[PDB]
Amino acid sequence: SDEINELKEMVKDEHIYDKLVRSIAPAVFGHEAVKKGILLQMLGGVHKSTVEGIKLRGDINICVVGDPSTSKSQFLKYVVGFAPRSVYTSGKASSAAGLTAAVVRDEEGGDYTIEAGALMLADNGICCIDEFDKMDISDQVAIHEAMEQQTISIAKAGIHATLNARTSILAAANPVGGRYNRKLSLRGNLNMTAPIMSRFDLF
């Protein structure tokens, strides 16, 4: 009963929208523009499927770009420690699976088995990638379908499957050069390509 009263008192407030934005990641200082994006990502969007089984995405992907030592990682750290389901990784993932799934087979007879990656483990959560601009070519290509169709299709020797990857990506990247150059456009300062750049809701 007490918590409900608190909830009602929250909605009745007229500054409520501003208060929530100012209450995200209080550790960081003076980045209200970013905080609004993170809050909107947590709430997400409505997930819809058409009358013929075509699925429309409802997850918000955010990319953050900045010079070294600008609290980029501090934003990812807050999200993983706060969001219900989340996974903190890096573009240069150590595991064999990487951001997507991979097939690994035990010694001799053992048939092939699927080893989950970052995007699979964060199902229905938020996947935070610390250095997007350093991803591997296999994952760079494989991220195309995961971000839009929300699946990972693998067809290897003896094993074929479609793996759910219904996750929202919150990435952090460094400029192609040492520092963000104000003269060039966002396209020039980033090593990403047009198909990926169109898959991010906010920058």
Partner: peptide, 21 residues
Amino acid sequence: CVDEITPSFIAEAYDLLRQSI
């Protein structure tokens, strides 16, 4: 916490997209 999207929200979402260009 509203169940109907008003144009004021559409305008707000438009602003965020512009700042990302």
